[PDB]
Amino acid sequence: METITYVFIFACIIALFFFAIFFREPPRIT
């Protein structure tokens, strides 16, 4: 149960990295 919890949180962070890079708000010059 503890191992599942640690790996789950880690996996969410890796997923977050993916969205934060490839699905970021695009920088736009105004």
Added chain:
Amino acid sequence: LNLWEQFCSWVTSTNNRLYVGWFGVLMIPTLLAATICFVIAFIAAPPVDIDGIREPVSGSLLYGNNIITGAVVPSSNAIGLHFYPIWEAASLDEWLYNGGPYQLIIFHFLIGVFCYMGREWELSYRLGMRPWICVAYSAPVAAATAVFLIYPIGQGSFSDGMPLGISGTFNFMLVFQAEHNILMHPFHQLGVAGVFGGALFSAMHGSLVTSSLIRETTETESANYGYKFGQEEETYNIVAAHGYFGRLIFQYASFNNSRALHFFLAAWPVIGIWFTALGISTMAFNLNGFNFNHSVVDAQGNVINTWADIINRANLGMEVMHERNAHNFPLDLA
């Protein structure tokens, strides 16, 4: 163009979402190999005989660790500095017992971050930038190289490289202090000045720029909306900031030149980290911190202890306890 030139154009393209480049051609596979092996080992690797005395240390989550205690454990002292790839083992089971994952990971990782450094040079060149961000990044690279490669070489074993884990990092620090008195070494003291000062100057610079943001928003808006990405006008009043900081101390202690200021912000932590990396890399050859043990002596010859002698008592406690089954002879010579 021919197919090779098309490939070169893609590799060196400024329009890839992540820059590849020739350094990236080495960086990407090596960082992937190191990352994948590390994640699998941290979760599932069996215990590793780090000190070569058939006393395996459990590092992985499934073998009883949490995030704080877990590690990928350095390779066996019986291996020393020998190169121990998977194909030198008779089996994966042997490879795992002897700490094979540690070597695969640190060697791919070090190649990867050296190439990450070259890649920072490379993109700056493709974008028409000045080139020296990679020189700033050379400080963390030097520090990682010191603890994963130079220190093991000097001591004769990757079993004395820093473990890949949170508590294993602390173990490395405590034993290092016992064996080198790093706290009393001026290069580590410069390192501390580097990171305390870097944190101080980050907070100082952050607070001074934030203090002088030009009013562009109402009180119900984040002030951050007062800056638009790519606008040409500066977003804070550096004359106001200097007028504040120069009065906080005195006028000539404050930067009025933003280029000088930002050079100082780069140089202070980078130089401090260079020196602390050199501290580890030279204590790797046992040139150790200052030794004032018994330096103060009274008229008869009695030692008068100083705080250095109290430090020595703490170092002794770590010395005599560390690797409690590994020493058979009276001196710890590596």
Added chain:
Amino acid sequence: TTGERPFSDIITSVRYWVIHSITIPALFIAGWLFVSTGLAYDVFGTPRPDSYYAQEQRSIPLVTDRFEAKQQVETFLEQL
């Protein structure tokens, strides 16, 4: 730009050095004598090299009593 005389003016003037060729060495020598006469030991209560221990006892004269601590250092010092 706050109205005081620039330091570079001051420390390159002969008048500054006429004054400070006297005052800086006088202060330095006074500090030297504060030590060489032994006065520093007595002002601050710092043991001289022969005064940390008596000849037979090899125990630290540690203060153990808060409100008669002053008198206790007096006793430890009379034991030398």
Added chain:
Amino acid sequence: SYPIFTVRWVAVHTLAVPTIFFLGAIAAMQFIQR
């Protein structure tokens, strides 16, 4: 032209005067033998 005794003058000497006295004291200490 310029004033000579200022707040700055006081701040300079509150630091500089003891510093020189202390350096003379510490120089003397280098010749103390046990």
Added chain:
Amino acid sequence: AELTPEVLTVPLNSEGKTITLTEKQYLEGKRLFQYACASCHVGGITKTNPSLDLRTETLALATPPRDNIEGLVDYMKNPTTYDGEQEIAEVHPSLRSADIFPKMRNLTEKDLVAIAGHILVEPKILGDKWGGGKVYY
């Protein structure tokens, strides 16, 4: 505390005669001990054989007795095992083996007396710390 004539008075021979060393002799002995001996005997222990130390009580039970000037000076000329049974000049620095322990080549008779005096005086200053090892650091 002070380095007094009483502290500097040590047994000269095994018959109870004493000798009073000068402060110069003591300082000479400490210097020569560091020059020729401390690489193995720092603080009164023995790095290459920790079972044998330089405490006065240990020296007194050596054969022949080494807890006096004559015994120590003789040891530096013709060292023996603790029971006196074997001569060990081939593996221990001595005047007899100055050819293979070259730091002994310029030690005079006066130098040996000073080293011996240092070995006997130092536990009178340091107590159990002399020969105690790291426990006493």
Added chain:
Amino acid sequence: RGWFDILDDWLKRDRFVFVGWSGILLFPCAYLALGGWLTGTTFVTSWYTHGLASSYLEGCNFLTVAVSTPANSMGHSLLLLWGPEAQGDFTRWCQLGGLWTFIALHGAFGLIGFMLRQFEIARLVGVRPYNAIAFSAPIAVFVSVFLIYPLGQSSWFFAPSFGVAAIFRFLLFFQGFHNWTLNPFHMMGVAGVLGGALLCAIHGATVENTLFQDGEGASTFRAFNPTQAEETYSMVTANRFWSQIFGIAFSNKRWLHFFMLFVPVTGLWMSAIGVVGLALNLRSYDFISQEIRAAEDPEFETFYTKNLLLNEGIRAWMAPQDQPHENFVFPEEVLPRGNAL
């Protein structure tokens, strides 16, 4: 008109060293804290409080001098010069450790004065007082470490002593007795300090390597004017570089500089909370599940159990000299030691 407004005028004159109302608190307290430290490290012993030499006069060097804490028997006495311990005797006061509370307390009020100075000058110049707000982190550290920690312990004796090696001893004490590296509040402190140093380096390097060519010199510092309207470096190019190198990049300069305050200030505040816990010995010392397993299974070993053995060595080998009021005599047969060493 009015003596208060006339005094306010003089305090706020634009001069080489600004004074202000805050200066009435700051300058005497800062001068006395620094002067006390220089006085103690130059001339004052720790023989009667610690059994230690601690001054240049006794033979220490810059790394080993200190103004050391009072003896444990003093408890948390303010140790005022005119108080019941020293009774006005300056010499005895120094021997009792009175300079430690002198420095700690004048230092505390000087830090108050300094943060008031940051507020006062910001108000006079017309800027927002974020520099003062950021300085709350140094204050949180000073108060938690030099005042709250010893106040939770038996006496000022266990506060840090004001010296280089004395502070190193404090670090190793916290390792051996508190297992302070294991504490998640210290870990957040480390992330904020190293993260702040990282931000300092990377931002300074990024600005210096995305500069616009605003002059002809190969040395580029002269090509900046403090009064110029234009950014001196390209945020757009900097943003593309880091986006392609690292995957993300700043796009908002105001957020960037706020973040540079946030990270180290927050880290120091977190480390202070952990130290408040250690004032009560409320440590992150153990993982209970680790201990239950290790107690039942003598083949189970982790880096966590390895570090506790080091801690046990620290306590047994350092306590007799580090805690002289306890009169510890540990016969050498009881000292924990591995094989041979």
Added chain:
Amino acid sequence: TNRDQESSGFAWWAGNARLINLSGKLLGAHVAHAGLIVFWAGAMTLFELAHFIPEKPMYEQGLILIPHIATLGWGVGPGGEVVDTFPFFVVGVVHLISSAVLGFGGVYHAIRGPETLEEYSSFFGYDWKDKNKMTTILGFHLIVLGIGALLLVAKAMFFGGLYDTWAPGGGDVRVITNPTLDPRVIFGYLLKSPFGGEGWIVSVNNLEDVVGGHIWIGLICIAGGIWHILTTPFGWARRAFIWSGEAYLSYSLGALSMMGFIATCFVWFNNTVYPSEFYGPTGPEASQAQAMTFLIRDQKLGANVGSAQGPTGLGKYLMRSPTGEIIFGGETMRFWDFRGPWLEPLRGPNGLDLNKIKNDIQPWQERRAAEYMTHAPLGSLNSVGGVATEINSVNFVSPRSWLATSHFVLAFFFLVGHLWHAGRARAAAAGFEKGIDRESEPVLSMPSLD
């Protein structure tokens, strides 16, 4: 002139960059700097000699230059004993005198002679962009370096030999008569792994290979120098490199950095061209010598050191390497690749030989192991010898530690300097080393990433 920022474009703290296109003054800077190097070699040697006590080991006296002279066979005899200090004196004086000549020429070219050389001499003048002139000067210097490598050969073969720690019967000066010429051996060193038990070129363990290697290097450098005098860079080279003064400097900085790290490892592990008689034992050596010391002591007391099981189950004195060889136990199991003349008589085909250990250990071996165990390269920055918890008493830091640490520090900063100047030379050749053109910012002409 141009000796200000306004005319030269460089601030005072980058003032030597004002010399990039002033070949006469730059020659002066280089010649004067060579005088500084030679000055130090001479003065430091005389200082070492003035402080030298011939009956203490060199490594007890903080010497790094006298050991270099002694390794060449000058001043020493069997076992490394100093028989004559006059060669040390000669080396020191002649370097010191020579540095006056170099300093004279450097000062002359730097402030008195022609500021540029091209108007004065087409032979000595040069343009950094003239690729053929660049390879010609490179070629002259390759020939000079090749001659230098052959001077070592001539010393070893015709002018008294070299100090050989491996000489049969004990270390001694020995004339090398059969240097190794077989390229399979010489260049085989180049293809050895740098990892444990292999050690790349740092593993060279006999003077025949050392001398033969310098014969090859001497001829390679002379032949390469002739080649570069007679050729101009090929097209593929022209297209691959930056051709500028700062670029060439950056290439040499990378090279010197690499060489510095190599010398660090050489002095740390190698005991052939850094004899332990002069430099002290290596780290591996002293750790092995401790195990040897207590094996000898306990066996004298009656221990059967082959059958003695240590606390872990491994042999207390003797165990197996991962490939089966008999090696010393305890922590020094990591150091089983160590080889030294005091230990090899005990080694047989299967490793350390128990019968030789029981019967054949000589007093000179016990002495050497005791000496090396107690001169391990551990010590403090203020030169307190021993482990970090040692008390003050012994004034010792091994020459190997001084030489390894100094050259790691220098090699490191030279790698940083390589990155600095390589990055700058690239940017300067492409025309943006002074910053981004506001009216021609490259990223503004690129498609957005998203």
